[PDB]
């Protein structure tokens, strides 16, 4: 019948007005956290480096290529 | 909310890419420090020794075996 084919339009239309979240905060959040931690752990070296009088280019850092250039 | 789960899935795909430092750098820096103490310690006797007059089969070495090889 058309009225049941009209309700399943209907529910359809329902169905895909969903609202969306701003997924963006948390994707953001997650990834300055991560640059947070990778940034922290050269306090250890640079802290070791300054307390033993090295030069600037005299301190190795066991940096590895962050994907986010953090 | 499929968008939810490929959020979830962006997350952890994050998390997982986390960069890690080089820590063979700490752990050797550690090892050869402790190897350093551990070979120092017997300057003591090896001056005394020499400083005695004994022979190298003469001198005894407190020495105790020791992990890595020293």
Chains 1, 2 share one sequence.
Not at 4 to 27: D, K, R, S, T, W
Not at 29 to 58: F, P, Y
């Amino acid at each position: 019948t058309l009225i049941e084919l009209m309700i399943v339009v209907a529910i359809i239309g329902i169905l895909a007005a969903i609202a969306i979240p701003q997924y963006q905060n948390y994707i953001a959040k997650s990834q300055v956290s991560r640059v947070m931690s990778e940034t922290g752990s050269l306090k250890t070296v640079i802290e070791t480096c300054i307390l033993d009088g090295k030069t600037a280019a005299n301190c190795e850092l066991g940096w590895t290529n962050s994907n986010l250039l953090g």
